[PDB]
Amino acid sequence: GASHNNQVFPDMSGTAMTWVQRVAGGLGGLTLAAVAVLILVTCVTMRR
Amino acid sequence: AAVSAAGLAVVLSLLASCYMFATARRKCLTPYALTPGAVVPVTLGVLCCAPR
Amino acid sequence: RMCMKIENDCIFEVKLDGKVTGYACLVGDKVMKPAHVKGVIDNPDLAKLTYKKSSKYDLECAQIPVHMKSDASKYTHEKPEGHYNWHHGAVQYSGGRFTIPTGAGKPGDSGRPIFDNKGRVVAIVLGGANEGARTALSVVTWTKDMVTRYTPEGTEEW
Ligand SMILES: CCCCCCCC/C=C\CCCCCCCC(=O)O[C@H](COC(=O)CCCCCCC/C=C/CCCCCCCC)COP(=O)(O)OCC[N+](C)(C)C
Ligand SMILES: CC(C)CCC[C@@H](C)[C@H]1CC[C@H]2[C@@H]3CC=C4C[C@@H](O)CC[C@]4(C)[C@H]3CC[C@]12C
Ligand SMILES: CC(C)CCC[C@@H](C)[C@H]1CC[C@H]2[C@@H]3CC=C4C[C@@H](O)CC[C@]4(C)[C@H]3CC[C@]12C
Ligand SMILES: CCCCCCCCCCCCCCCCCC(=O)O
Ligand SMILES: CCCCCCCCCCCCCCCCCC(=O)O
Ligand SMILES: CCCCCCCCCCCCCCCC(=O)O
Ligand SMILES: CCCCCCCCCCCCCCCC(=O)O
Ligand SMILES: CCCCCCCCCCCCCCCC(=O)O
């Protein structure tokens, strides 16, 4: 029988989690850039 | 299931970003077209890909 | 009385269920139709077009066909301090506000332009707020690049 606790979740810093985190970081950066652009635009619109 | 959900989340993220970006572009380019005679300034024309 | 004949060609009526609801104008190379007006332009050539949607600005415009430009009224951006012309009377311009004597406007009758001395369009009426004997006018106003909608407080749409 297995001598471990049967844990298959990779480390937060594992290669698979590293690629997932990279993709999430890029997507989040794009989303936050869009959010900042829209909020600046809306601020300018209420400014005028 | 995990890969399908991740792909759905990525597609939703991309669609939301693109749509809200296009909302920003429209909101920025609508008044100039409404004016009977106007020229889209070249700075905003290139900044937001003016139709003409 | 030249402003009236200039209005004749420019204004094409909007009729919903056989009641003229508002009007449209051939200004520059577009049709100045207010967004709040629900209905059908009488001339088909302007009805078969695709119209843009704008709520904050309250306008609807579409490119008029090559036969409609010769029929269109002229535009201008001179808003000097003084007196302009209107279909039902005169518009007094002072402090960036169009004002009419009360009793010259009933509901409906929206979309009629405002003309200066020598015929150049300057405004498109949307509504107005009752103000003593001198009622104001919600209106679409324009510059070199920008169009601005100035709506007085407590304004009704007529
Ligand atoms: C945009 C990316 C994210 C969107 C999709 C995320 C998936 C969720 C949707 C699907 C449901 C089915 C899958 C459940 C996953 C939860 C894991 C779990 O079950 O975690 C368990 C406990 O939780 C945790 O520690 C963390 C809680 C959630 C984990 C967060 C990250 C998980 C991975 C997702 C990122 C990548 C997704 C796919 C990427 C592909 C690229 C295109 C892991 O413990 P265990 O293995 O010992 O338990 C099993 C017991 N045993 C082994 C004896 C059978
Ligand atoms: C369409 C979007 C939203 C989600 C994408 C999910 C699809 C394209 C992906 C997710 C995970 C993928 C599977 C993962 C691994 C295998 C095992 C391989 O031996 C045959 C293909 C197969 C079975 C893949 C087929 C395509 C698949 C089902
Ligand atoms: C973003 C949405 C649409 C999900 C996209 C998932 C793509 C990038 C991934 C998910 C699962 C992947 C597949 C998983 C397994 C295999 C079998 C292998 O022998 C060749 C590659 C192939 C066929 C992969 C191709 C790329 C693949 C389809
Ligand atoms: C994370 C980094 C933060 C820095 C943010 C930089 C801001 C981006 C520079 C230019 C922003 C201008 C976009 C707004 C559109 C301008 C036209 C308009 O407002 O009408
Ligand atoms: C006349 C109609 C104008 C619309 C088409 C021309 C302008 C569109 C922008 C040009 C293409 C941009 C690429 C796709 C948008 C990228 C958004 C994103 O993924 O973050
Ligand atoms: C995730 C990579 C870095 C994040 C920054 C990405 C920069 C995107 C470009 C900005 C959008 C263009 C600015 C004008 C947009 C508009 O108002 O129409
Ligand atoms: C998650 C979506 C928004 C809900 C959270 C609202 C809390 C933040 C406040 C919104 C910004 C208000 C500031 C004024 C600027 C504006 O009018 O756009
Ligand atoms: C993963 C490598 C990079 C891929 C992502 C590149 C991001 C593209 C930028 C999108 C911003 C919107 C583009 C239109 C802006 C405009 O010209 O008006």
Residue numbers in the entry:
A (entry chain A): 391 to 438
B (entry chain B): 368 to 419
C (entry chain C): 111 to 268
Paper text:
Getah virus (GETV) is a mosquito-borne arbovirus, and belongs to the Semliki Forest group of the Alphavirus genus within the Togaviridae family. Among them, one polyprotein consists of four non-structural proteins (nsP1–nsP4), and another polyprotein is composed of five structural proteins, including the capsid, E3, E2, 6K, and E1 in order from the N-terminal to the C-terminal.
Similar to other alphaviruses, GETV has an icosahedral symmetry (T = 4), comprising 60 quasi-threefold symmetric trimers (Q-trimer) and 20 icosahedral threefold symmetric trimers (I-trimer). Each asymmetric unit (ASU) consists of four E1–E2–capsid heterotrimers, with three heterotrimers forming one unabridged Q-trimer connected to one heterotrimers from the I-trimer. The atomic model of the E1–E2–capsid heterotrimers includes the full-length sequences of E1 and E2, as well as residues 111–268 of the capsid protein. Therefore, we accommodated the atomic models of stearic acid in the straight proximal portion of the density next to E2 C385 and C395, and fitted atomic models of palmitic acid in the densities adjacent to E1 C433 and E2 C415 and C416.
